[PDB]
Structures are given as C-alpha cells and as structure tokens.
C-alpha cells in the first residue's frame, strides 16, 4: 500500500490489455494482476511488458496506450 | 424444528404426537417476562 | 461368484503334497490315496479342524481329467488405439471441435441396456500438429475419466511416443501438459481397468467400451475425425480373484450354506485361498451309477487348485502324484 | 457441597406437560335454507 | 472485457452529528452473501430414525450377452487374427466362455446375428471357471465362420434350441439373476463463539470507491452463520474414507471425524464433464446419448439449472447455430426481435432485443434454461472467466432426469431434532451442534458441464 | 456438556465443559455399630488367617 | 487435508494471492470439542452539507 503502478501486458493469443494496481513493488504489482485479474484461471496468459510508477508532478500525461490492429489478428 | 402442524387429522399419528413431546424435552423465549434466574433471586 | 453345476462341485486346496496320511500336519496339505488295484481315488486333505476326505472316485466312471494353467484363466485387458483418420486429414484442421465419445456397454448393470458415455473435447488451433493434438486429447479425456471423486475407474489413457513405440506414457487428471514433452505422439491408447472386488458378494467383471467420433468439416464434408482399432493386449489381470470366489462358493457344498447370515450366530469356514497368488486348476469330472435299476448318472466333480510360480511346479507335482496312484493319463502342463 | 431436570427427585417423578396450538383444516360451507331464500 | 474496482473489503485491524436515514444503506457497489437455502429447499427432506448408516436396494436389469475368451480349432489350437475360416463343412470346433451361461443343443450367435449361428454339441467342459463348448454351424454354412468374428470380446446371445421331429432328447436350460444395494453416511457440525448484543473481534469494514475519498446482534449472526455451516456440509461435503472404510481425519478427542459426502460430490460421479469451450455440438450429443438409451421420446425435457452469465453463454451459442441455418430466413413477423412500442416521441416507435432460452434437438430432446442465482457467488467462486463473471455461473446442471416416481435427491434429517445448543459461562461461549446428510439415490440421473478451469 | 444422555435433555444454558459428554456422580456416608461384642461369638477356620 | 486426499495438494495451489473461503466445521459423532467462529461487519458513513 505504498505506490501506484500502471502496467501494460499481453494476454497470450487473446489480445492486449491495460491495468493499474496498488502495490509496494512491481513484483507485487504483477502478483495482484495474475491473482485478481479476469484471467485468474488461466494466469499463464499474462505477459507483462512494461510497469511504470504513477508519479504525480506533471499532473497531466498519458501512461498507457495499446491499440489492437486489424493486421495483428 | 418443531414438527409440521399443517397436516390432516389422519396424518397426525401416534408417532407424530410423540415427536411433539420429544421437542419439549429439548427445551423461555418470552420477551415480556424476566429470566428464571432473575425471579428466583426475587423470591 | 455363483457358478453353474452339472451336479455338485467340490474344491480342495493343495498347498503341499505329502506321501502318507500320517504326515498331514498343517492347514492345506493333501495326499492322493488309492488302492493297489487302481479302482478308487480320493483326496485326504488337512482341513483347518481335522483330516477330511473327498468322494471316492471309481476310476471306471471318469469322463475327463484336464488341468488348466494360470495364464489360460488370466483375463487380458483390451486396449484401443485412437489415431487421426488419414484419408480425412493427417493434420488437425484449424478451428474445429474434436469430440471423442467413449461408449460403455455394461456400466452398473448386468446388461447391454445399461449404457454410459464419457466425452473428451479439444478445439483445434492454426499451428496445432498431430502430435500436439494427441497430447491435448489425452489431458481432456483423463480429466473427465480419471477424476479422484468418481464411482469406479473406467479406462486408462496412454500415449505412445514414436521414438519409443513400445513404452506407453501414462496421463491422468493430475498430469499437466508440461510433463508430456515428447514431440512425436502417434496414438492414444485407451485401456480398460480392473473393477473392484470383494469375495462372494461382488464377483469379478469388466466394463467393455468402443470409442466413437463426432463428425468434423475439413472441406465442407461431415467426416469422422479419427479411427480406433483394438491392438493386442499387454496387461493381464491375475487369476487370484477368480479362485477365492470359486472357493467361497464350493466351500458351501461341504461347509455351511448360511455363510454369515444371522451374524453373531453363524459358522465361519476358514478359506485357504490367497487372492494375491495365481493358481492352476485341475478338474476331474466323474459320476456314480447304482446297482440294478438306478442306472442314472449322478455327474459330480472334484476340483483341485494349487499355487504356481512361473513354471508350474506344484500342479505338475500334483498331476504326477495322481497319475501313479490312480493310473489315469492326465496331461502334464 | 460443591467445591438439569432429572427423572426423579426424592422419590417424586418428573411430569412435563406440553400444550400447543396446532393447525386444523376445516371447511366453510355456504348452503341455502330450504324454507326461505337465505 | 474489463472491470473496475468499486469497493474494497478491509478488516478492522488495518484501521453525535445528526443522521439522514436511520436504517443502513447497502450500495450496489458491494457484493452480498448468497444463501444456498432455496437451492437446498428445492429438494425434499427424508426423515430418519437415528444416526445409524442406512442402505437401500438397487434393482438392475437382466438382458445379458456373454463375451468370448477365445476360440479353438477341433485339434485344440487357438484361433488367431490372421487365421483362415474355422469350421468349414460343418466340422466342429471349440469355444471358450468365462461362464457357463448356455446349455446343450442351443443356438448362440456372434456379433453378426443369424448369419453364423453356432449350435452347441453338448454340455460345457469346465476349465477352471471358464466353460468350453463344442460348437458347429446352424445355417447351412459351407464356407465357415471367419477368424475376425471369433476373437476375444465378441458378444454372444441365446436364440433357441431346435430338435428333430422323431425321438428328440433334452436341450436348453433357464437362467437366474439377483440385485444389489448401496449405502450412505452422516456428518456432524459444530460452531462456537465467545461472547449479549455487541460485536467481537472478527470484523471487516467495507470501503466504497467514491470520488471524494448500531450494535451487533450476535444471536442472529450465530444462527445464520451456523445455518451456512449446515448448508455447506449439505452441498460442498467430501467423504474422507478409503475403499476399506477407515477414516482419514481424526479429531481432538482421538475419535475419527466421521464426515459424509455432499450434493456436488455425489452427483459428479456420473455424467460429469469438463469442457474447454462451450458448444451445442457437445451438448446436443451428450444429451442425446443419455436419452437414446435411458428415456422415452416424450420424456426428454431437460431443464438446465445454471448461472446468469452461463445463460448468455447459452444465448450466444444457440445464436451461432441459427446463424448456420442458411435454409431458413428468420423474419421479424415470426420471431419478433423488433417489436413496436407506443412512445411519446413518435407515432411508429420500436423496441429491440431478444434472447434464446430454448433449443429443441432431434427426436424430441428439448432444452430449457433457468438461472439459479447462487452460482454467481463472489465469495465462494474466485476463479474468474474472461467474458465476465465468476466462472461458476458458466456451469450447467440437469437435475431430475426423467420421472422416477420418487425423489432422487433429498436432505437427510433425524426424527425429533438433530439440533443442539449450549451456553457456557465462566468466558461466555455459545455452542451449537447439528448432524445431517444428503442422499443422491441415482447419480446417473444428473448431468453436469463444469468448466475445465475448475478442475485439477 | 451440550446434552445429558442420563436425564434426556438437549440444551444447556449453564454448560459444564466444552466436551459432548455427561458424567454421573454418586456419594454416600454409611456405617455400622455393634454395641456389645460379648453378646456375639465367632468361630473361624484358621486357614483364613483372620 | 480433508476430503480423502492422499496424493497431496499441488504446489501451484498454494501460491501468493490465492483467496481462501470458509466452508464448514466438522467434528465427530462422539465426544466432540469446540470449533468454528462467527464474523461481523461495521458500517462507514457518507457526508453532506447545506
Ligand atoms: Mg450426476
């Protein structure tokens, strides 16, 4: 319960995804995704590609973006 | 579970009446009386 | 296990072969006694409360005396080799639902009108080859079939690696697909299993099965996705559970017929058949014929059982003892 | 000293009496008087 | 397909102005407990005399046919798969069966009935427990029977026992059967609580996720949370015995904890199935083969009891099957996906929407769909499904297969009262005790499609 | 504890111990008196050793 | 482990983050002792002004 973490990941073969957790470290930010996300019974599908902390003082900025494409399917 | 009182007069059999008395043995609920422990101290 | 009788059938457990009637000292010994004229053969055996004799076989009134080895009664468990149908497609076509229907015929019944059907399901992928599909079909089959919380186990699922081709790998519901690492799987072996057994009350039977396939579309045609042939069996159920049921029946012609009914007030016959040993059986079938007008045959029989270990030493000693005493020509197995 | 309803106490017996209201099914019937239309 | 956390349930250990409303508010951003009561009160209750185990007779069926062990030539050698024809010219041969089921002079038939009929030439020479008959052909067969139709596992039925018109002698015999029986056990439940209307230690506070971020009734909570012990030992109970009968779990007094099975452990021993994807190709064949052999043609009404998200999983699965029905073109005059509603906004105003709840398979197999709400449990069911839900609402169940003239599933209870209670003062402990059980008579009369992500 | 098998009662507002049980206790105080042992004579075999 | 389990629970079923829920509390038919406990909830207050 220290910091906030925006993640970008990849459910394997199904699509892309965006997530955000509250965890002490990114080893626990990946823990809450693989244990409380919707792919809880197929938790090997999660492939987290980028974790970055929500630091404030910009106060206006993008953090995550992932478009699935008609050519990726 | 006090046994079922929604029965015909024929299905209130001798074992059914005996099951009612056996519920009385396993034992009060009243909310306008004091407890037995309270009234015995008064006596 | 109840059996049918021409007329009465007695079984004598030959645990050890002595040479005279005085050395019968432990439970299970036997001596084939005869005359010097070879006209009457009987078996004195040490029953657990004293010496008992069999019926007196007049040697003129025998019909057949044959001896059956242990592998001739041991039941071979049947296997089924499930492959992909080569004419339909040698590869799994992508996006199709592959369902295999196992059709049991004697489940929880004595009849072929008690059926039971267990299924397995694999949907196919674009890069799924034949060896990966056989891996996926066995996990989804064993997850339905060999759960721990079933009534009885039904069949066993095995894969065959093409590099090995003679050693089967087991797959259960506890096996994950990370364990199966071979890249050349060519068939799925479905093998029936040994049902539960208690002596006297639940006899030994098996549930047969044939696998059936649901049709898939490969080129717009509804075609069955596989074929299933029956290979020669590799596993055999030992002969111990048939004889312990056979003695439990036949110790009631000699012993008591109320084998424990009014439970504290009963008689308990001591049974000397160990179900964890295989056995050979010697059958001597014979008859009785009366004096003048009682010319009807009363065709009874005396069964001899003996434990064998590889080469049948105890049964061929017993056949050798009867052949010199009675003078018959029982074949030596 | 010491440092529950029994069946007996000093020769007396234990009499437990239960009184309860159960549910009896009865019919309400509408009939007509034969003499007047009531 | 993505969520957003609307609440967080945290314990108390990690933690008058006037009121608007006195009665508390339950937000929609708060899950609630789900009682299994109306799932368990849908079953009847069979009352028992005492705590002893009980048994009942299982009456089966009769019409057998016997497998073959091997087939032998007249000289004693066994037949093989690559052998030639056996019994050419009506020459006799031998035939080994594991039981003595047929008699002399009878006609027995192979897998090809009435093409190769086998007439038995005398009584069975017994071999161990097997039965060896000497047989010949009863159909004018000059070519014999092939070795393919004389292997192990071939079924053999009885036909008749034909004799000669002049000076015939005795043939044939009659056969007998016997039934079986089955048992079931019990389970004992206890609860305690150290207390009176005020809370105790085990506290969980509910924090809502909004933008600007009484006194406890004990005797209603210990009655309700013990009822949920009684509901869970009914439904989610597991048996802890061997196939020898010895228990595996011993309690604090040294006596073994005697625990019996539940509904979902008893009903999942037959017709259970773990699927990776739901399709009607599987469901219409799993429901046909049970109804091809165990049901008539009018008695094939299967009511799926399921969850809520499984009902839209059945909706979108039927819709894909009707999408493949290229011959029939569905119009709004018949299906009425688009209805006309009278509205203030327009003279001719419309409505839109539909849902499939039924499917009628060939030969009279009809499928209903009703939703049982305790399948959508957020506490009990924690593995999530990617289409939304708790992956247990995606489980299908068919209770009450056919008509049995008797309840197949019921809840056991002891005559009188199996409930006990106690209060222990000094430490003010409240005790409760109850024994119970559930009996499924025929577990082959219940079919279940469980997700494959909830196994192993 | 929670029930008395002796007196046939299920339910205990004042429990003794947490165990599902019941223990029956009995006690008695008793004695005899022989005022004149010269009004009473005995004759014992001496293999009883008194 | 309770439900007849003889081959053990896997190591993948006991990881960090696996949620655990209460089912029930069994004891024996003979000489049982106390098990189980009962849980509660407290409310949180919202706020508004004039
Ligand atoms: Mg079932």
From Swiss-Prot, chain B:
Subcellular location: Virion
Superkingdom as given in the UniProt entry: Viruses
Main function: Forms the portal vertex of the capsid. Probably involved in head assembly, genome packaging, tail attachment, and genome ejection.
Record text on subunit structure and interactions: Homododecamer. Interacts with the Cargo protein 1. Interacts with the major capsid protein.
Protein name: Portal protein
Span within the parent record: 6 to 51 of 806
UniProtKB/Swiss-Prot annotation, chain C:
Annotated coiled-coil segments of the chain: none
Keywords annotated in UniProt: Capsid decoration protein, Capsid protein, Virion
UniProt keyword Calcium, yes or no: no
Signal peptide (from-to): none
Positions of the UniProt region annotated as FD: 75-237
Function: Auxiliary capsid protein that forms an outer layer on the major capsid protein protrusions.
Stated name of the protein: Auxiliary capsid protein
Phylogenetic lineage: Viruses, Duplodnaviria, Heunggongvirae, Uroviricota, Caudoviricetes
Swiss-Prot record, chain D:
Residues in the signal sequence: none
Annotated localization: Virion
Taxonomic superkingdom: Viruses
Subunit record text: Homododecamer. Interacts with the Cargo protein 1. Interacts with the major capsid protein.
Functional note: Forms the portal vertex of the capsid. Probably involved in head assembly, genome packaging, tail attachment, and genome ejection.
Protein name: Portal protein
Source species: Bacteroides phage crAss001
Curated annotation (Swiss-Prot), chain G:
Subcellular location(s) per record: Virion
Coiled coil: none
Additional information: Displays an HK-97-like fold with an insertion domain that protrudes at the capsid surface.
Function: Capsid protein self-assembles to form an icosahedral capsid, with a T=9 symmetry, about 77 nm in diameter. Each asymmetric capsid nonamer is covered by 9 capsid auxiliary protein, 1 copy of the trimeric head fiber protein and 2 copies of the dimeric head fiber protein.
Subunit (UniProt): Interacts with the auxiliary capsid protein (via FD region). Interacts with the head fiber dimeric protein. Interacts with the head fiber trimeric protein. Interacts with the portal vertex auxiliary protein.
Protein name: Major capsid protein
Organism of origin: Bacteroides phage crAss001 (Bacteroides phage PhiCrAss001)
Covered range of the whole protein: 153 to 202 of 504
């Amino acid at each position: 319960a220290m910091q906030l973490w925006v993640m970008e990941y990849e459910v394997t073969g199904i699509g892309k995804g965006c997530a955000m957790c509250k965890a002490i470290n990114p080893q626990q930010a990946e823990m809450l995704l693989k244990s409380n996300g919707i792919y809880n019974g197929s938790s090997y599908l999660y492939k987290v590609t980028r974790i970055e902390q929500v630091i404030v003082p910009p106060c206006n900025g993008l953090m995550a973006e992932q478009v699935v494409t008609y050519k990726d399917v | 579970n006090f046994p079922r009182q929604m029965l015909p007069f024929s299905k209130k059999t001798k074992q059914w009446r005996k099951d009612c008395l056996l519920w009385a043995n396993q034992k009060n609920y009243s909310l306008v009386r004091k407890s037995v422990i309270h009234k015995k101290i008064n006596y | 296990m109840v059996i049918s009788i021409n007329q009465v059938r007695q079984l004598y457990v030959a645990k050890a072969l002595k040479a005279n009637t005085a050395a019968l000292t432990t439970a299970g010994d036997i001596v084939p006694k005869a005359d010097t004229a070879k006209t009457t053969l009987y078996f004195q055996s040490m029953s657990p409360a004293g010496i008992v004799a069999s019926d007196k076989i007049n040697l003129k009134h025998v019909l057949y005396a044959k001896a059956t080895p242990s592998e001739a009664l041991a039941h071979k468990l049947v296997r089924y080799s499930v492959t992909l149908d080569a004419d339909v497609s040698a590869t799994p076509v992508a996006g199709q639902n592959y369902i295999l229907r196992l059709a049991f015929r004697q489940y929880i019944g004595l009849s072929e009108e008690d059926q039971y059907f267990k299924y397995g399901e694999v949907i196919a992928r674009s890069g799924m080859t034949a060896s990966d599909f056989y891996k996926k079909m066995a996990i989804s089959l064993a997850k339905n079939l060999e759960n721990k919380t079933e009534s009885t186990p039904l069949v066993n699922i095995y894969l065959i690696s093409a590099a090995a081709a003679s050693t089967d790998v087991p797959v259960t519901s506890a096996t994950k697909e990370s364990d199966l690492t071979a890249t050349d799987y060519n068939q799925i072996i479905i093998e029936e299993t040994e049902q539960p057994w208690v002596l006297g009350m639940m006899p030994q039977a098996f549930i047969p099965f044939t696998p059936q396939f649901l049709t898939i579309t490969v080129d717009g045609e509804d075609r069955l996705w596989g074929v299933a042939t029956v290979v020669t069996p590799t596993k055999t159920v030992p002969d111990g559970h048939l004889i312990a049921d056979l003695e439990y029946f036949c110790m009631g012609a000699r012993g008591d017929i109320y084998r424990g009914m009014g439970y504290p007030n009963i008689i308990k016959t001591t049974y000397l058949v160990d179900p964890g040993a295989v056995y050979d059986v010697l059958d001597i079938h014979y008859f009785y014929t009366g004096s003048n007008e009682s010319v009807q045959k009363s065709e009874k029989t005396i069964t001899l059982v003996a434990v064998d270990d590889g080469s049948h030493t105890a049964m061929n000693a017993l056949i050798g003892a009867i052949n010199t005493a009675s003078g018959l020509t029982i074949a030596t197995l | 000293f010491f440092d529950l309803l029994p069946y007996d106490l000093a020769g007396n017996l234990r009499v437990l009496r239960l009184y309860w209201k159960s549910k009896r099914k009865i019919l309400k019937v509408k009939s007509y008087d034969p003499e007047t239309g009531e | 397909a993505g969520k957003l956390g609307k609440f967080q349930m945290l314990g108390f250990q990690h933690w008058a102005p006037q009121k608007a409303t006195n009665l508390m508010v339950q937000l929609l951003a708060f899950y609630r407990g789900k009682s299994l009561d109306t799932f368990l009160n849908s079953f009847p209750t069979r009352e028992f005399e005492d705590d002893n185990e009980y048994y009942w007779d299982v009456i089966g069926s009769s019409r057998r046919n016997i497998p073959l062990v091997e087939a032998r030539d007249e000289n004693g050698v066994v037949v093989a798969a690559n052998a030639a024809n056996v019994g050419v010219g009506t020459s006799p041969f031998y035939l080994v069966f594991p039981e003595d089921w047929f008699a002399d002079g009878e006609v027995i038939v192979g897998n090809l009935n009435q093409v190769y009929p086998f007439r038995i030439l005398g009584d069975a020479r017994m071999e161990g427990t097997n039965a060896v008959y000497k047989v010949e052909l009863m159909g004018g067969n000059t070519q014999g029977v092939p070795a393919e139709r004389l292997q192990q596992g071939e079924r053999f039925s009885i036909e008749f026992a034909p004799v000669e018109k002049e000076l015939s002698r005795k043939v044939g015999d009659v056969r007998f059967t016997s039934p079986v029986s089955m048992r079931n056990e019990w389970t004992t439940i206890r609860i305690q609580h150290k207390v009176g209307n005020k809370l105790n230690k085990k506290l969980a506070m509910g924090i809502p996720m909004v933008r600007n971020l009484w006194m406890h009734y004990v005797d209603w909570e210990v009655e309700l949370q013990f009822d949920e012990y009684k509901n869970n030992a009914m439904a989610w109970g597991t048996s802890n015995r061997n196939l020898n009968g010895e228990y595996m779990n011993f309690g604090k007094s040294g006596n073994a904890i005697k625990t019996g099975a539940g509904i979902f452990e008893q009903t999942e021993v037959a017709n259970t199935m773990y699927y990776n994807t739901f399709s009607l190709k599987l469901l219409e064949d799993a429901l046909y083969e049970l109804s091809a052999s165990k049901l008539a043609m009018d008695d094939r009404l299967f009511v799926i009891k399921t969850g809520e998200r499984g009902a839209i999983q059945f909706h979108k699965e039927v819709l894909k099957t009707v999408s493949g029905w290229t011959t029939f073109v569905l119009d709004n005059n018949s299906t009425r996906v688009v209805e006309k509603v009278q509205s203030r906004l327009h003279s001719n105003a419309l409505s839109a929407g539909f849902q499939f709840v039924e499917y009628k398979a060939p030969n009279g197999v009809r499928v209903r769909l009703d939703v049982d709400p305790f399948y959508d449990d957020p506490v009990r069911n924690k593995i999530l499904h990617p289409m939304g839900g708790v992956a247990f609402s995606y489980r299908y169940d068919i209770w009450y297969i056919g008509t049995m003239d008797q309840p197949n599933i019921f809840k056991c209870k002891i005559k009188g009262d199996n409930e006990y209670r106690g209060y222990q003062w000094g430490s003010a402990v409240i005790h409760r005790m109850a024994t119970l059980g559930v009996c499924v008579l025929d577990p082959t009369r219940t079919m279940s499609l469980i997700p494959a992500i909830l196994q192993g | 504890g929670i029930r008395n098998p002796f007196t046939g009662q299920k339910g205990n507002p004042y429990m003794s111990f947490d165990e599902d049980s019941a223990v029956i206790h009995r006690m008695a105080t008793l004695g005899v008196c022989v005022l004149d042992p010269t009004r009473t004579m005995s004759l014992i075999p001496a293999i009883l050793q008194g």
